[PDB]
């Protein structure tokens, strides 16, 4: 030991840091045995060990030398013809859909014969050879047709002859096999929509498509399942008198305003199903709705597919004057989300004419921001088929590197209504979308045109006003879900969709990931976060109850959590009751509303409420709880499909003044939607119980919100927590997940408005499933 100088010390320690860094880099270099492990985890291919084409071209030479260093069947007389029948059917189908003509209906149904299909495809070519008339002759080479049903619902689409019996029960997306090779999809409704990508993308979609600023990417959702109807007034060519009335009948007086007529922005809100038979009106909560208008009179309405079938049935009930237009297989939108979604979307499309909408959209696409733009951004134009490009390219002008809000003020005043609404009129009418397919080419044809440009003359295919298929293209902003949706015809979506993620900062979304995005932005979701409506309650309660009951009864005894014997749940444990509030599984709102009406009956019976000891005399809690258990035991035998139990209050508090016989449950209970964030340690889960703070120990929770600590310097929560009673429940959390954008836990809850006006403070305690701890937090109102 001997003292040294300062400079020698810092030089020796810096040399030691450099030596450790060099040794770590040398160990990392010697640890790798191939360049196949040099790829990122997203781009790793299992096939790349066999063939060279998966590896990038820079790395393939080292891959080739390391691979070199490391190193028509028997068919009977019947099954051969059975295999040649399919090959002849595919060849005749290719020639028939390629040469001139459309699809026969007998080949579409595919329920009679295949020999009749062969005879029909033989007959159509001969009839085209012998005569020009009597031919349903198409407008293009690729087999695209017009699946538009005027005044009726759209039937099962024709598709392709090979994959026809695979479309017998459920229909497909236009990107069905594309999504099938890259994502897990689910068959729930009549389509097959995506559920989640194959690679894990929870935190990835959370950071790139989320509300976070570091969102250097783009996320695309195939939202072709969202069904739209187009309504137009046939009665009068003048101003629309019945349109405002039918909007005020379908929705409330919340989505039928003069501002939405003038500024023509799409609005997403809550639709409720009306029913008027004779002098009586019954209103039930139906679900979400998207309403959009074209300057006065024509309207597109798009929403959930079962809700789409119900709204189409109600609209076909009263179809006296106006003409309806069902669009299930002729128009669909896809949803882009992120910061560079606008840049990739402007990269995917090019211009065919110098117009104002191109300038506005290219000025929007450079700011890399969403919420600084105003509420209305609905752009529309005519563009080229994106198969002309087939390469990741972005187009950006000089623009002198300046972005200000003064250009954003030009977006609110100078809006090209005429051309955008003309593109709207092109997409609504079936004739213009049929005329759009007048010059659709095959991939061989566009490859031949690219070869002609490579021979004559750059990586492009030029535009010709005579023989190029100019499409209508519409890109609009959706407000509350914070995402840009772009709508297009059915067979046009795939040339747009294929060029999207070939931009190397664009990924695809599953509906689980879409639920994560709706959970992140404090928004709501219809199959899960909508329990008040009829279909949401039925679907969520029945399916999650049966699933969780099968999962619980499937596990052996002594490995799962036992819901029957849990001690110390509430203070003063009530007799004949040793379990948890309501059903242990998916949120039984029946228990909550019967308990709320029981406490209301106790408050109407006396100024205070007693604790404990054909309908027996209700004087305390357990007489209500035994009625709850008896009604549950009765409804386990026969399912309930009569009425709902919990509506919303946010439409009732403003106007109806939330006003509420031997009755226990006839008049339902209304709720407001809240989002509560955890201030104490812990995270929420699904089906969580929301309690209220009692009249006692409020100052204890205020001190815990200010500060409570052990003398070590950190937070302390190993204390005797005061237990409230059973009837202090005020809500349910359906979706409980640790919210990564807040650093705490978020629970989407639904609390009573009377209980909201009881406490003067917004402090709410949460309890999980099978866990006996109580965690405090604060809520904010969800105005959705």
């Amino acid at each position: 030991g001997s003292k040294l100088n300062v400079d020698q010390f810092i030089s020796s320690r810096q040399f030691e840091v450099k030596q450790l860094q060099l040794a770590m880099h040398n160990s990392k270099a010697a640890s790798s045995t191939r360049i196949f492990q040099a790829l990122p985890r997203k781009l790793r291919r299992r096939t790349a060990s066999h063939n060279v084409r998966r590896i990038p071209k820079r790395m393939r030479n080292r891959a080739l030398r390391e691979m070199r260093k490391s190193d028509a069947h028997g068919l009977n007389a019947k099954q051969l013809y059975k295999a040649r029948m399919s090959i002849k059917l595919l060849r005749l189908a290719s020639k028939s859909t390629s040469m001139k003509l459309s699809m026969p209906p007998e080949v579409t149904s595919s329920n009679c014969h295949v020999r009749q299909k062969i005879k029909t495809l033989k007959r159509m070519i001969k009839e085209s050879s012998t005569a020009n008339p009597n031919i349903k002759l198409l407008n293009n080479r690729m087999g695209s047709y017009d699946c538009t049903g005027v005044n009726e619902l759209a039937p099962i689409p024709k598709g392709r002859v090979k994959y026809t019996k695979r479309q017998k029960h459920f229909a497909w997306l236009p990107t069905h096999i594309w999504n099938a090779k890259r994502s897990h999809m689910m068959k729930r409704w009549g389509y097959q929509m995506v559920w989640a990508p194959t690679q894990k993308c929870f935190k990835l979609t959370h950071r790139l498509g989320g509300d976070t600023c570091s969102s250097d990417g783009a996320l695309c959702m195939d939202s072709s399942y969202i069904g739209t109807i187009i309504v137009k007034d046939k009665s009068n060519d003048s101003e629309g008198d019945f349109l405002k009335s039918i909007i005020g009948k379908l929705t409330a007086e919340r989505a039928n305003l003069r501002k939405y007529r003038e500024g023509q922005v799409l609005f997403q809100g809550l639709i409720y199903s009306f029913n008027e038979e004779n002098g009586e009106d019954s209103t039930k909560p139906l679900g979400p709705c998207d309403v959009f208008w074209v300057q006065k009179d024509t309207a597109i309405i798009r929403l959930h597919p079962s809700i789409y079938t119900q709204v189409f049935n109600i609209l076909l009930q009263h179809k006296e004057k106006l003409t309806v237009q069902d669009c299930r297989y002729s128009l669909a939108s896809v949803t882009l989300k992120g910061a560079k979604a606008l840049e990739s979307l402007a990269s995917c499309l090019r211009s065919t004419e110098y117009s104002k909408s191109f300038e506005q959209f290219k000025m929007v696409s450079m700011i890399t921001d969403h919420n600084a733009l105003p509420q209305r951004c609905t752009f529309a134009f005519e563009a080229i088929d994106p198969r002309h490009l087939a390469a990741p390219k972005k187009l950006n002008d000089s623009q002198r590197k300046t972005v200000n809000s003064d250009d954003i003020l030009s977006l609110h005043e100078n809006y090209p209504q005429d051309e955008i609404n003309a593109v709207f009129n092109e997409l609504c009418d079936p004739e213009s979308r049929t005329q759009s397919y007048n010059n659709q080419n095959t991939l061989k044809e566009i490859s031949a045109r690219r070869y002609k440009l490579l021979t004559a003359t750059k990586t492009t295919v030029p535009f010709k006003e005579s023989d190029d298929p100019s499409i209508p293209l519409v890109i609009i902003r959706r407000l509350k879900t914070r995402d840009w949706i772009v709508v297009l015809p059915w067979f046009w979506l795939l040339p747009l969709w294929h060029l999207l993620n070939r931009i190397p900062r664009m990924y695809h979304i599953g509906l689980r990931q879409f639920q994560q995005i709706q959970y992140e932005n404090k928004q709501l979701y219809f199959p899960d976060d909508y329990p008040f409506t009829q279909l949401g309650y039925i679907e969520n309660s029945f399916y999650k109850k049966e699933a969780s009951k099968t999962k619980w009864d499937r596990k052996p005894m002594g490995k799962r959590i036992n819901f029957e014997k849990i001690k110390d749940i509430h203070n003063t444990k009530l007799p004949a009751y040793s379990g948890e509030i309501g059903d242990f599984f998916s949120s039984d709102w029946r228990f909550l509303q019967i308990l709320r009406n029981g406490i209301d009956y106790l408050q109407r019976n006396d100024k205070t409420l007693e604790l404990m000891d054909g309908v027996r005399d209700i004087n305390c809690v357990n007489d209500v709880l035994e009625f709850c258990k008896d009604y549950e035991a009765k409804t386990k035998a026969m399912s309930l499909s009569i009425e709902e139990n919990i509506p919303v209050a946010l439409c009732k508090n403003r106007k109806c003044q939330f006003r509420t016989s031997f009755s226990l449950t006839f008049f339902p209970r209304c709720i407001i939607a809240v989002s509560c964030t955890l201030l104490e340690r812990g995270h929420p889960k699904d089906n969580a119980r929301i309690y209220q703070v009692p009249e006692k120990d409020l100052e204890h929770w205020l001190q815990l919100a200010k500060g409570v600590y052990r003398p070590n310097g950190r937070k302390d929560h190993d204390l005797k927590i005061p237990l409230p009673e059973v009837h202090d429940l005020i809500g349910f959390i359906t979706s409980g997940t640790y919210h990564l954008n807040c650093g705490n836990g978020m629970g989407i809850g639904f609390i009573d408005h009377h209980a909201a006006i009881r406490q003067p403070t917004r402090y709410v305690l949460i309890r999980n499933v099978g866990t006996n701890t109580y965690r405090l937090g604060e809520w904010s109102k969800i105005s959705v």
Binding site: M186, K187, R188, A547
Partner: peptide, 24 residues
């Protein structure tokens, strides 16, 4: 909103639809 989806991963997909359903 939990990762353990009982109804979604088995009963509602197209790969495990041939398997006996979770309501059954």
């Amino acid at each position: 909103m939990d990762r353990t989806q009982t109804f979604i991963k088995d009963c509602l997909f197209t790969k495990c639809l041939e398997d006996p359903e979770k309501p059954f």
